[PDB]
């Protein structure tokens, strides 16, 4: 393991893939989520930039104090109604945007956090564009059309929408989305599916979604979170690494090859980097077909 990663032990083949690539700046990931905090050191040296949807009215920046309030409530481990009442007591008007922006920090750090920082992401060397949505199907469709125009190889999300999704597929662009295109479910620390983890089966893959380490706004201290939307960025990173390797070998980026290699090798099952590598760059067994 030339680049030890938190998930090496939970993801067979990750260390070996990291040994070959940490990503390529010709691979662009567009993240449709909240507004992440680019002052965090995990983004120091990351190829990150923000493109705000121009059709949104800009929202007021959220204070560090508001984030600290949210983070204190999380750190306390407040749960159902207790958590709701506490958020309402202190950040009633900003809690919803904070959830989204907090999620954006975490997801983005999982994908692109720099090695040796508090968050080492799956693909620290890929180009990442955040397209923040916190200022707000139609809107998502508009975001996807913009992401395409921005040069996305991968669009990470969360009738007009159905067509926008098809346009991605028709144009060699991978869509990654959590179950609640590559659908991603969440595995427990031991590889089995989390109970909350939600066509999901047909075109979906399981990945670690429990106790994933990532960044939170306004502080250098990382936090471990659990959910299918914690597992999706892991697959976005893996997918970007596999695309990076296509570029490394002089070959063209092929998003559908990456997607099918991952699915062919619990939904469709747990991510199998070694099997997918064999399909993409080796000599796969006919039995995989």
CSV table of C-alpha atoms in Angstrom, one decimal:
chain,number,residue,atom,x,y,z
A,1,UNK,CA,0.0,0.0,0.0
A,2,UNK,CA,1.9,3.0,-1.3
A,3,UNK,CA,-1.0,5.3,-0.2
A,4,UNK,CA,-2.6,3.8,2.9
A,5,UNK,CA,-6.3,4.7,2.9
A,6,UNK,CA,-8.9,4.4,5.7
A,7,UNK,CA,-11.0,2.0,3.5
A,8,UNK,CA,-8.1,-0.2,2.3
A,9,UNK,CA,-9.2,-3.0,4.6
A,10,UNK,CA,-12.9,-2.6,3.8
A,11,UNK,CA,-12.3,-2.5,0.0
A,12,UNK,CA,-10.3,-5.3,-1.5
A,13,UNK,CA,-8.1,-4.0,-4.4
A,14,UNK,CA,-8.3,-0.3,-3.3
A,15,UNK,CA,-4.7,-0.2,-2.1
A,16,UNK,CA,-3.5,-1.9,-5.3
A,17,UNK,CA,-5.5,0.5,-7.5
A,18,UNK,CA,-4.1,3.5,-5.4
A,19,UNK,CA,-0.7,2.0,-6.1
A,20,UNK,CA,-1.4,2.6,-9.8
A,21,UNK,CA,-3.3,5.9,-9.7
A,22,UNK,CA,-4.6,8.6,-7.4
A,23,UNK,CA,-6.5,10.0,-10.3
A,24,UNK,CA,-6.0,12.1,-13.4
A,25,UNK,CA,-6.9,15.8,-13.9
A,26,UNK,CA,-8.4,15.0,-17.3
A,27,UNK,CA,-11.2,13.2,-15.3
A,28,UNK,CA,-13.8,15.8,-14.2
A,29,UNK,CA,-16.3,15.0,-11.4
A,30,UNK,CA,-19.2,17.4,-11.0
A,31,UNK,CA,-20.8,17.2,-7.6
A,32,UNK,CA,-24.4,18.3,-7.4
A,33,UNK,CA,-24.9,18.9,-3.7
A,34,UNK,CA,-24.5,21.8,-1.2
A,35,UNK,CA,-21.8,24.4,-0.8
A,36,UNK,CA,-18.5,22.9,0.6
A,37,UNK,CA,-15.9,24.7,2.7
A,38,UNK,CA,-12.8,25.2,0.6
A,39,UNK,CA,-10.8,26.6,3.5
A,40,UNK,CA,-10.4,23.1,4.9
A,41,UNK,CA,-6.8,21.8,4.5
A,42,UNK,CA,-8.0,18.5,2.9
A,43,UNK,CA,-8.7,20.6,-0.2
A,44,UNK,CA,-5.3,22.3,-0.1
A,45,UNK,CA,-3.8,21.4,-3.4
A,46,UNK,CA,-7.0,19.7,-4.7
A,47,UNK,CA,-8.1,20.6,-8.2
A,48,UNK,CA,-11.5,21.9,-6.9
A,49,UNK,CA,-13.7,24.8,-8.1
A,50,UNK,CA,-17.3,26.0,-7.6
A,51,UNK,CA,-19.8,26.7,-10.4
A,52,UNK,CA,-23.0,28.1,-8.9
A,53,UNK,CA,-26.1,27.5,-11.0
A,54,UNK,CA,-26.6,31.0,-12.5
A,55,UNK,CA,-30.4,30.7,-12.3
A,56,UNK,CA,-30.2,30.6,-8.5
A,57,UNK,CA,-30.6,33.7,-6.3
A,58,UNK,CA,-27.5,33.8,-4.1
A,59,UNK,CA,-28.2,32.9,-0.5
A,60,UNK,CA,-26.7,34.6,2.6
A,61,UNK,CA,-23.5,32.9,3.8
A,62,UNK,CA,-24.0,30.7,6.9
A,63,UNK,CA,-22.1,31.8,10.0
A,64,UNK,CA,-19.4,29.6,11.6
A,65,UNK,CA,-21.6,29.9,14.8
A,66,UNK,CA,-24.5,28.3,13.0
A,67,UNK,CA,-22.3,25.4,11.8
A,68,UNK,CA,-20.9,25.0,15.3
A,69,UNK,CA,-24.4,24.7,16.7
A,70,UNK,CA,-25.2,22.0,14.2
A,71,UNK,CA,-22.0,20.2,14.9
A,72,UNK,CA,-22.4,20.3,18.7
A,73,UNK,CA,-25.9,18.7,18.4
A,74,UNK,CA,-24.4,16.0,16.2
A,75,UNK,CA,-21.5,15.5,18.6
A,76,UNK,CA,-24.0,15.1,21.4
A,77,UNK,CA,-25.6,12.2,19.6
A,78,UNK,CA,-29.2,13.6,19.8
A,79,UNK,CA,-31.5,11.4,17.8
A,80,UNK,CA,-35.2,11.6,16.7
A,81,UNK,CA,-37.4,14.3,18.2
A,82,UNK,CA,-34.7,15.5,20.6
A,83,UNK,CA,-32.5,16.3,17.7
A,84,UNK,CA,-35.3,18.1,15.8
A,85,UNK,CA,-36.2,20.2,18.8
A,86,UNK,CA,-32.6,21.2,19.5
A,87,UNK,CA,-32.0,22.3,15.8
A,88,UNK,CA,-35.3,24.3,15.9
A,89,UNK,CA,-34.2,25.9,19.2
A,90,UNK,CA,-30.9,27.3,17.8
A,91,UNK,CA,-30.7,27.2,14.0
A,92,UNK,CA,-34.4,27.1,12.8
A,93,UNK,CA,-33.7,29.1,9.6
A,94,UNK,CA,-30.4,27.6,8.5
A,95,UNK,CA,-30.6,24.0,9.6
A,96,UNK,CA,-31.8,22.7,6.2
A,97,UNK,CA,-29.1,24.5,4.2
A,98,UNK,CA,-26.5,23.3,6.8
A,99,UNK,CA,-27.5,19.7,6.3
A,100,UNK,CA,-26.8,20.1,2.6
A,101,UNK,CA,-23.6,22.1,2.9
A,102,UNK,CA,-22.3,19.8,5.6
A,103,UNK,CA,-23.1,16.8,3.3
A,104,UNK,CA,-21.2,18.6,0.5
A,105,UNK,CA,-18.1,19.0,2.6
A,106,UNK,CA,-18.1,15.3,3.6
A,107,UNK,CA,-18.9,14.0,0.1
A,108,UNK,CA,-16.3,16.2,-1.6
A,109,UNK,CA,-13.6,15.3,0.9
A,110,UNK,CA,-14.4,11.6,0.4
A,111,UNK,CA,-13.8,12.0,-3.3
A,112,UNK,CA,-10.9,14.4,-3.4
A,113,UNK,CA,-9.4,15.1,0.0
A,114,UNK,CA,-5.6,15.3,-0.2
A,115,UNK,CA,-3.3,12.6,1.2
A,116,UNK,CA,-1.7,13.5,4.6
A,117,UNK,CA,-4.6,15.8,5.3
A,118,UNK,CA,-7.3,15.0,7.9
A,119,UNK,CA,-9.3,13.5,5.0
A,120,UNK,CA,-7.6,11.4,2.3
A,121,UNK,CA,-10.1,11.0,-0.5
A,122,UNK,CA,-10.4,8.1,-3.1
A,123,UNK,CA,-9.3,10.2,-6.0
A,124,UNK,CA,-7.2,13.2,-4.8
A,125,UNK,CA,-5.8,13.9,-8.3
A,126,UNK,CA,-9.0,14.2,-10.3
A,127,UNK,CA,-10.5,17.6,-11.2
A,128,UNK,CA,-13.6,18.3,-9.1
A,129,UNK,CA,-16.3,20.9,-9.8
A,130,UNK,CA,-18.8,21.6,-7.0
A,131,UNK,CA,-22.2,22.9,-8.2
A,132,UNK,CA,-23.8,24.0,-5.0
A,133,UNK,CA,-27.6,23.8,-4.7
A,134,UNK,CA,-28.2,25.2,-1.1
A,135,UNK,CA,-29.5,28.6,-2.4
A,136,UNK,CA,-32.8,27.0,-3.6
A,137,UNK,CA,-36.6,17.6,-10.7
A,138,UNK,CA,-36.6,20.6,-13.0
A,139,UNK,CA,-33.7,22.2,-11.0
A,140,UNK,CA,-31.8,18.9,-11.1
A,141,UNK,CA,-32.3,18.5,-14.8
A,142,UNK,CA,-31.0,22.1,-15.3
A,143,UNK,CA,-28.0,21.2,-13.1
A,144,UNK,CA,-27.2,18.1,-15.1
A,145,UNK,CA,-27.3,20.0,-18.5
A,146,UNK,CA,-24.9,22.5,-17.0
A,147,UNK,CA,-22.7,19.7,-15.5
A,148,UNK,CA,-22.5,18.2,-19.0
A,149,UNK,CA,-21.5,21.5,-20.5
A,150,UNK,CA,-18.8,21.9,-17.8
A,151,UNK,CA,-17.1,18.7,-19.1
A,152,UNK,CA,-18.2,16.2,-16.5
A,153,UNK,CA,-17.0,12.6,-17.0
A,154,UNK,CA,-18.9,11.8,-13.8
A,155,UNK,CA,-21.9,13.6,-12.3
A,156,UNK,CA,-22.4,12.8,-8.6
A,157,UNK,CA,-26.0,13.5,-7.6
A,158,UNK,CA,-27.3,13.6,-3.9
A,159,UNK,CA,-39.7,13.7,-17.4
A,160,UNK,CA,-37.3,16.6,-18.0
A,161,UNK,CA,-35.1,14.8,-15.5
A,162,UNK,CA,-35.5,11.4,-17.2
A,163,UNK,CA,-34.3,12.9,-20.5
A,164,UNK,CA,-31.3,14.7,-18.9
A,165,UNK,CA,-30.3,11.4,-17.4
A,166,UNK,CA,-30.5,9.7,-20.8
A,167,UNK,CA,-28.4,12.5,-22.4
A,168,UNK,CA,-25.6,11.7,-19.9
A,169,UNK,CA,-25.7,8.0,-21.0
A,170,UNK,CA,-25.8,9.0,-24.6
A,171,UNK,CA,-22.8,11.2,-24.2
A,172,UNK,CA,-20.4,8.9,-22.3
A,173,UNK,CA,-21.0,10.5,-18.8
A,174,UNK,CA,-21.6,8.4,-15.7
A,175,UNK,CA,-24.3,9.4,-13.2
A,176,UNK,CA,-23.7,8.2,-9.6
A,177,UNK,CA,-26.5,8.4,-7.1
A,178,UNK,CA,-27.3,6.7,-3.7
A,179,UNK,CA,-30.3,4.4,-3.4
A,180,UNK,CA,-31.6,6.4,-0.3
A,181,UNK,CA,-26.6,5.2,-14.1
A,182,UNK,CA,-24.9,3.7,-11.1
A,183,UNK,CA,-27.1,3.3,-8.0
A,184,UNK,CA,-25.1,2.8,-4.8
A,185,UNK,CA,-26.3,1.1,-1.6
A,186,UNK,CA,-24.5,1.2,1.8
A,187,UNK,CA,-22.6,-1.7,3.4
A,188,UNK,CA,-21.9,-2.1,7.1
A,189,UNK,CA,-18.2,-2.2,8.3
A,190,UNK,CA,-18.4,-6.0,7.7
A,191,UNK,CA,-19.6,-5.8,4.0
A,192,UNK,CA,-23.3,-6.7,4.7
A,193,UNK,CA,-26.0,-4.2,3.7
A,194,UNK,CA,-27.1,-1.6,6.2
A,195,UNK,CA,-30.9,-2.1,7.0
A,196,UNK,CA,-32.0,1.4,5.9
A,197,UNK,CA,-30.3,1.0,2.4
A,198,UNK,CA,-33.0,1.0,-0.3
A,199,UNK,CA,-34.1,-1.0,-10.5
A,200,UNK,CA,-31.9,-0.3,-7.4
A,201,UNK,CA,-31.1,-4.0,-7.6
A,202,UNK,CA,-30.7,-4.2,-11.4
A,203,UNK,CA,-28.2,-1.3,-11.8
A,204,UNK,CA,-26.9,-1.0,-8.3
A,205,UNK,CA,-23.8,-1.7,-6.3
A,206,UNK,CA,-23.0,-2.0,-2.6
A,207,UNK,CA,-20.1,-0.1,-1.0
A,208,UNK,CA,-19.0,0.9,2.5
A,209,UNK,CA,-21.5,3.4,3.8
A,210,UNK,CA,-21.1,3.1,7.6
A,211,UNK,CA,-18.6,5.2,9.6
A,212,UNK,CA,-17.1,6.9,6.6
A,213,UNK,CA,-14.5,9.6,7.5
A,214,UNK,CA,-14.9,13.0,5.9
A,215,UNK,CA,-14.8,16.8,6.5
A,216,UNK,CA,-17.3,19.1,8.1
A,217,UNK,CA,-17.6,22.9,7.6
A,218,UNK,CA,-15.5,25.4,9.5
A,219,UNK,CA,-13.2,23.0,11.3
A,220,UNK,CA,-10.2,20.8,10.6
A,221,UNK,CA,-11.6,17.9,12.7
A,222,UNK,CA,-13.2,15.2,10.5
A,223,UNK,CA,-16.3,13.1,11.3
A,224,UNK,CA,-17.6,9.6,10.6
A,225,UNK,CA,-21.1,9.5,9.1
A,226,UNK,CA,-23.4,6.6,7.9
A,227,UNK,CA,-25.8,6.5,4.9
A,228,UNK,CA,-26.2,5.4,1.3
A,229,UNK,CA,-25.1,8.9,0.3
A,230,UNK,CA,-21.9,8.2,2.2
A,231,UNK,CA,-21.4,5.1,0.1
A,232,UNK,CA,-22.1,6.8,-3.3
A,233,UNK,CA,-19.0,9.1,-3.2
A,234,UNK,CA,-16.8,6.0,-2.6
A,235,UNK,CA,-18.1,4.6,-5.9
A,236,UNK,CA,-17.7,7.9,-7.6
A,237,UNK,CA,-14.0,8.0,-6.5
A,238,UNK,CA,-13.4,4.3,-7.6
A,239,UNK,CA,-15.1,5.0,-10.9
A,240,UNK,CA,-12.9,8.1,-11.4
A,241,UNK,CA,-9.8,6.1,-10.6
A,242,UNK,CA,-10.8,3.4,-13.2
A,243,UNK,CA,-11.4,6.2,-15.8
A,244,UNK,CA,-8.0,7.7,-14.8
A,245,UNK,CA,-6.4,4.4,-15.7
A,246,UNK,CA,-8.1,4.4,-19.1
A,247,UNK,CA,-6.5,7.8,-19.7
A,248,UNK,CA,-3.1,6.6,-18.3
A,249,UNK,CA,-3.0,3.7,-20.9
A,250,UNK,CA,-3.6,6.2,-23.7
A,251,UNK,CA,-7.1,4.9,-24.2
A,252,UNK,CA,-10.4,6.9,-24.4
A,253,UNK,CA,-12.6,7.4,-21.3
A,254,UNK,CA,-15.4,4.9,-21.5
A,255,UNK,CA,-18.0,5.4,-18.8
A,256,UNK,CA,-20.3,2.5,-19.7
A,257,UNK,CA,-17.4,0.1,-19.7
A,258,UNK,CA,-16.5,1.3,-16.2
A,259,UNK,CA,-20.1,1.0,-15.0
A,260,UNK,CA,-20.7,-2.5,-16.5
A,261,UNK,CA,-17.3,-3.8,-15.3
A,262,UNK,CA,-18.3,-2.8,-11.8
A,263,UNK,CA,-21.8,-4.3,-12.0
A,264,UNK,CA,-20.8,-7.5,-13.7
A,265,UNK,CA,-18.0,-8.3,-11.2
A,266,UNK,CA,-26.8,-6.4,-1.8
A,267,UNK,CA,-28.2,-5.1,-5.2
A,268,UNK,CA,-25.8,-6.5,-7.8
A,269,UNK,CA,-23.4,-7.2,-5.0
A,270,UNK,CA,-20.4,-5.6,-3.2
A,271,UNK,CA,-17.8,-3.6,-5.1
A,272,UNK,CA,-15.1,-5.8,-6.6
A,273,UNK,CA,-12.2,-3.7,-7.7
A,274,UNK,CA,-9.9,-6.7,-8.6
A,275,UNK,CA,-12.7,-8.3,-10.8
A,276,UNK,CA,-13.5,-4.9,-12.4
A,277,UNK,CA,-9.8,-4.3,-13.1
A,278,UNK,CA,-9.5,-7.7,-14.8
A,279,UNK,CA,-12.5,-6.9,-17.0
A,280,UNK,CA,-11.2,-3.4,-17.9
A,281,UNK,CA,-7.5,-4.0,-18.3
A,282,UNK,CA,-6.9,-7.7,-18.1
A,283,UNK,CA,-8.4,-10.9,-19.6
A,284,UNK,CA,-11.7,-11.6,-17.9
A,285,UNK,CA,-13.3,-15.0,-17.7
A,286,UNK,CA,-16.2,-15.5,-20.1
A,287,UNK,CA,-18.3,-16.5,-17.0
A,288,UNK,CA,-18.5,-12.8,-16.0
A,289,UNK,CA,-20.6,-12.3,-19.2
